[PDB]
Amino acid sequence: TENLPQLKSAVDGLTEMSESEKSGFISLVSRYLIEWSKIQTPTDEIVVPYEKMTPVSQDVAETKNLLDKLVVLKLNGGLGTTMGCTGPKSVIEVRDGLTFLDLIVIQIENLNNKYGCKVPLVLMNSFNTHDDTHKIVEKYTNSNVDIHTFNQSKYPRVVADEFVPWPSKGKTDKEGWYPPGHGDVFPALMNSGKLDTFLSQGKEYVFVANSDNLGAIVDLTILKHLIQNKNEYCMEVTPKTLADVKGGTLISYEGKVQLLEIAQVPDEHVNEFKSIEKFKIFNTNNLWVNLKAIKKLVEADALKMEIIPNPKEVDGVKVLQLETAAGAAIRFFDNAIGVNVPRSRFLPVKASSDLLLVQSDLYTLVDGFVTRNKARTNPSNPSIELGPEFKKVATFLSRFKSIPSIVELDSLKVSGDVWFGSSIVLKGKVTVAAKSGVKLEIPDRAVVENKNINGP
């Protein structure tokens, strides 16, 4: 529906929304209420190859000067629900009993203890993760890193049929609201005052990343490039692969580079994105942004990102949750670029199949970094697919007495009730399928190479 003044009225009726939230929400709604025959590929001048960038000098002074201007920030608004875990997704243990946050903290600690810098870490969480995060972060109280947190905007989900805020019908508990996407990082950094708290200290850029992307580590070649070339925004993209279905690509449109996402794509064109031909790059959501520019553009209300409707059905009630993507803000910044980086900077962990990959001998932890085995000569990881039986992390761990060796694996598909013993080795293309009513136990020490195991 589209009665806007009617919508504003109800929004102001919702007392728990702060004034700044009511405003930002109404602006989104207002704007809510793609000539494919023009889409272009960005030139190499706009999307710079990382290998062409100049590394820092041997004098640590240059490193300290750059680090003294930096603030690191992570995206932590999500829960561990997909992987059968309660709490923030960042607090799931990924490698060696260390959580995603623990590894990110170690990494920055290693930076601060290494260079004598005091780069601060900022966590942007959601109401669906704030208090739990608040509790966990205290563990790092004496760590050599200042951990800052803040909550991004809390907006009312909108009932789609009648177009009114769900809280107005009385859905005022947690399921009545939602965080408006990571694009909200810009106004929320302002609303939180952290931006002004960092500007009063000297920071100039924020490195933004998904909390569950293990490949998102600080890269000095990239930070250097933005400083010397005055790039106010840099989006790390990676070559698009068959695995990259759900996400965005960077495109040139109207002579500027911009994120292209599914809502903007005409019906008769959805598989071309999926292709490996038309679009050859894919956003990793590792974003580098200039802080003064964020302040300037948020206060001027310039960040007009495309809306992502994300519809859901809760308790039966079909609702709409309008959101935005951080990468879509790239078209509003000056001298903005994409940098095409190797997939080692893009290791998302979204299912227990990814944990199998990261807990196996394909990787090891090195000073807080999940480091790929170099004995793996072929860059690509093995494709791993596990049935629902492996969905909950605890059940996944119960089903692998030890994580099997997969350095020599091309692909593993597991289905049905399957339990694995310790010290197993898997090579090539492997499948294990237990039929209904059957439980399959892979004994300890088994070597499975290019085999289809369909029963005892």
Secondary structure (3-state) at 226: helix
Amino acid at 119: V
Does the annotation place 182 within a ligand binding site? yes
Secondary structure (3-state) at 238: strand
Q: Which is nearer to ligand UPG, 112 or 284 (CB)?
A: 284
Asked whether position 248 contacts ligand UPG by CB under 6 A, the answer is yes
- Residue pair 247/283 in contact (Cβ under 8 Å)? The answer is yes
Q: What is the 8-class DSSP label of residue 152?
A: -
Asked whether position 126 contacts ligand UPG by CB under 6 A, the answer is yes
Asked whether position 77 contacts ligand UPG by CB under 6 A, the answer is yes
Q: Which is nearer to ligand UPG, 226 or 347 (CB)?
A: 347
Asked whether position 107 contacts ligand UPG by CB under 6 A, the answer is no
Q: Please state, in angstroms and rounded to a whole number, the distance separating the CA atoms of residues 232 and 190.
A: 17
At residue 365, φ and ψ (nearest 5 deg) are: -95, 135
Angle, helices 185-192 vs 19-32, to 10°: value is 160
Asked whether position 338 contacts ligand UPG by CB under 6 A, the answer is no
Asked whether position 324 contacts ligand UPG by CB under 6 A, the answer is no
Residues 160-189 that bind ligand UPG (CB under 6 A): 179, 181-182
Q: Which is nearer to ligand UPG, 210 or 264 (CB)?
A: 210
Segment contacting ligand UPG by CB under 6 A, of 71-79, 143-151, 412-420, 422-430: 71-79
Q: Which of 76, 99, 133, 290 binds ligand UPG (CB under 6 A)?
A: 76
Asked whether position 151 contacts ligand UPG by CB under 6 A, the answer is no
HEC-encoded secondary structure of 110-154: HHHHHHCCCCCEEEEECCCCHHHHHHHHHHHCCCCCCEEEEECCC
> Considering the complex, what minimum distance in angstroms separates the CB of residue 182 from ligand UPG?
4
> Residue 370 class from Cβ within 10 Å (0-12 exposed, 13-18 middle, 19+ buried)?
buried
Does the annotation place 75 within a ligand binding site? yes
Q: Please state, in angstroms and rounded to a whole number, the distance separating the CA atoms of residues 351 and 81.
A: 11
Segment contacting ligand UPG by CB under 6 A, of 101-109, 280-288, 360-368, 415-423: 280-288
Q: Which of 211, 231, 340, 359 binds ligand UPG (CB under 6 A)?
A: 211
Asked whether position 247 contacts ligand UPG by CB under 6 A, the answer is yes
Which among 232, 229, 250, 133 has a CA at the least distance from the CA of 186?
A: 232
Q: Which of 133, 210, 252, 415 binds ligand UPG (CB under 6 A)?
A: 210
120: left (phi over 0), alpha (psi -120 to 50) or beta: beta
Contacts of 8-13 with C-beta under 8 Å, sequence gap 24+, read 10/164, 10/165, 10/168, 11/156, 11/165, 13/168
Asked whether position 285 contacts ligand UPG by CB under 6 A, the answer is yes
Q: Please state, in angstroms and rounded to a whole number, the distance separating the CA atoms of residues 180 and 403.
A: 38
Segment contacting ligand UPG by CB under 6 A, of 193-201, 209-217, 371-379, 392-400: 209-217
Does the annotation place 89 within a ligand binding site? yes
Q: Which residues bind ligand UPG (CB under 6 A)?
A: 75-78, 124, 126, 179, 181-182, 210-213, 247-248, 259, 282-285, 325, 327, 348
